[PDB]
């Protein structure tokens, strides 16, 4: 079953804006958008922060849709579980909306490959905020533990945690 | 894929992680079709923010592979603030904008100089998926 595309769009815009609030970046930064889907989050990066960005997604159909949006960022067909294919210290920050739980679909190896290479691809002190939909607490702890081993500090923000409908989880990390 | 992206994208192959030749990729001058996109507005704050990170030798290499050798051999340097820019600074920043942001590869291919793996770009989008 499904949600209206306008409704998914509104929710994703809100989560992207919240992620950006959590990131607290300077304008005109260089940002990696991980699991960018059709580029809705990239649109907001451009407009809200005047940021320049690269978007990564595993899905050809999402990226094709991204092409139709007149985006200013670069879309790339790639698999976050194989690592972040950028040189050391490339990005100011990274953002990810509704995507990283896919890493859990060997998962523990892919999770470490993701966090180790992301740590490397961020400038020193670079930040990463990811909204994600965990299946359970163990999943949350596994992700947090992997980030920790990779060298990230920080923690977790849960908005509207009393709400079973509206509860959202944000990983908030610094390198 | 913007020229700027060529200055950060490296080989995705894990065995190449610690190889000096995983970056920059080697772009095929005979395959890469370039596009100028004037729609992306001049952003001098971004350029000032990015310049220290830019790998000039890698800019020179990729640009030469794409048929541009009309670049200064030394990385342009700038004051630390927008207000301190001169007209000459501004002109170079503008040239940097055109080069880095407004120039992209619409269709083409490039390979790792370490492992030889060849990556393809279609409709501006590089395919970075790694086969079995
Ligand atoms: Zn390689």
Swiss-Prot record, chain A:
Which protein are we looking at? 18S rRNA (guanine(1575)-N(7))-methyltransferase
* Family per record: Belongs to the class I-like SAM-binding methyltransferase superfamily. BUD23/WBSCR22 family.
Q: Where are the transmembrane segments?
A: none
Top EC class of this enzyme:
transferase
Miscellaneous: Present with 1620 molecules/cell in log phase SD medium.
Does this UniProt record's set of keywords contain Metal-binding? no
Gene Ontology terms for molecular function: rRNA (guanine) methyltransferase activity
Q: Where does the record place it?
A: Cytoplasm; Nucleus
* UniProt entry keywords in alphabetical sequence: Cytoplasm, Methyltransferase, Nucleus, rRNA processing, S-adenosyl-L-methionine, Transferase
> What role does this protein play?
S-adenosyl-L-methionine-dependent methyltransferase that specifically methylates the N(7) position of guanine 1575 (m7G1575) in 18S rRNA. Requires the methyltransferase adapter protein TRM112 for full rRNA methyltransferase activity. Important for biogenesis end export of the 40S ribosomal subunit independent on its methyltransferase activity. Required for efficient cleavage of the primary 35S precursor rRNA at site A2. Involved in positioning the proximal bud pole signal.
Catalytic reaction annotation? guanosine(1575) in yeast 18S rRNA + S-adenosyl-L-methionine = N(7)-methylguanosine(1575) in yeast 18S rRNA + S-adenosyl-L-homocysteine
| An annotated GO BP | rRNA (guanine-N7)-methylation
Tell me which GO cellular component terms the UniProt record holds: cytoplasm; nucleolus; nucleus; tRNA methyltransferase complex
Q: Which organism is it from?
A: Saccharomyces cerevisiae (strain ATCC 204508 / S288c)
Q: Does the keyword S-adenosyl-L-methionine apply?
A: yes
Q: What is its main location?
A: cytoplasm
Q: How does it assemble?
A: Interacts with TRM112. Interacts with ECM16.
From Swiss-Prot, chain B:
- Please indicate if the UniProt record lists Oxidoreductase as a keyword: no
- Which locations, inside or outside the cell, does it occupy? Cytoplasm; Nucleus
Reply yes or no: does the keyword Ribonucleoprotein apply: no
Q: What superkingdom heads the lineage?
A: Eukaryota
Domain TRM112, first and last residues per copy: 2-131
Q: What keyword terms does UniProt attach to this protein?
A: Cytoplasm, Nucleus
Gene Ontology MF: a single term: protein heterodimerization activity
Q: Name one GO biological process term.
A: tRNA methylation
**GO cellular component terms given for this protein:** cytoplasm; cytosol; eRF1 methyltransferase complex; nucleolus; nucleus; ribosome; tRNA (m2G10) methyltransferase complex; tRNA methyltransferase complex
Question: Where would you say this protein principally sits, based on its record?
Answer: cytoplasm
| Oligomer and partners | Heterodimer of MTQ2-TRM112, forming the eRF1 methyltransferase. TRM112 is necessary for the solubility and activity of the catalytic subunit MTQ2. Interacts with TRM11; required for full tRNA methyltransferase activity. Interacts with BUD23; required for full rRNA methyltransferase activity. Interacts with RCM1, NOP2, TRM9 and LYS9.
Task: Cite any additional comment in the entry.
Answer: Present with 4800 molecules/cell in log phase SD medium.
What family, per the record?
A: Belongs to the TRM112 family.
Q: What does this protein do?
A: Acts as an activator of both rRNA/tRNA and protein methyltransferases. Together with methyltransferase MTQ2, required for the methylation of eRF1 on 'Gln-182'. Together with methyltransferase TRM11, required for the formation of 2-methylguanosine at position 10 (m2G10) in tRNA. Together with methyltransferase BUD23, required for the formation of 7-methylguanine at position 1575 (m7G1575) in 18S rRNA. Involved in biogenesis of both 40S and 60S ribosomal subunits.
State the name under which the record lists this protein: Multifunctional methyltransferase subunit TRM112
Q: Gene behind this chain? A: TRM112
């Amino acid at each position: 079953k499904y949600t209206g595309s306008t409704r998914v769009q509104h929710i994703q815009a809100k989560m992207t804006l919240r992620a950006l609030e959590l990131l607290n970046l300077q304008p005109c930064s260089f940002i990696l958008d991980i699991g960018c889907g059709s580029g809705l989050s990239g649109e907001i990066l451009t407009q809200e922060g005047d940021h320049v960005w690269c978007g990564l997604d595993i899905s050809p159909s999402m990226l094709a849709t991204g092409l139709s949006r007149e985006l200013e960022g670069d879309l790339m067909l790639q698999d976050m579980g194989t690592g972040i294919p950028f040189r050391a210290g490339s990005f100011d920050a990274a953002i990810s909306i509704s995507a990283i739980q896919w890493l859990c679909n060997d998962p523990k190896q892919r999770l470490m490959r993701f966090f180790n290479t992301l740590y490397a691809a961020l400038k020193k002190g670079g930040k990463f905020v990811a909204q994600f939909y965990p299946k359970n607490d163990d999943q949350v702890d596994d992700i947090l533990q992997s980030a920790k081993v990779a060298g990230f500090s920080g923690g977790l923000v849960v908005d509207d945690p009393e709400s079973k409908k509206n509860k959202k989880y944000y990983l908030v990390l610094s390198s | 894929m913007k020229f700027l992206t060529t200055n950060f994208l490296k080989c995705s192959v894990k065995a190449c992680d610690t190889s000096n030749d995983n970056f920059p990729l080697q772009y095929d001058g005979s395959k890469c079709q370039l596009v100028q996109d004037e729609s992306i507005e001049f952003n001098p704050e971004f350029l000032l923010n990015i310049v220290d990170r830019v790998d000039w030798p890698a800019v020179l290499t990729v640009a030469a592979e794409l048929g541009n050798n009309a670049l200064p051999p030394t990385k342009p340097s700038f004051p630390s603030s927008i207000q301190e820019l001169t007209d000459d600074d501004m002109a170079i920043l503008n040239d940097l904008h055109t080069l880095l942001l407004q120039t992209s590869i619409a269709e083409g291919e490039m390979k790792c100089r370490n492992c030889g793996h060849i990556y393809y770009i279609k409709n501006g989008i590089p395919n970075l998926l790694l086969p079995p």
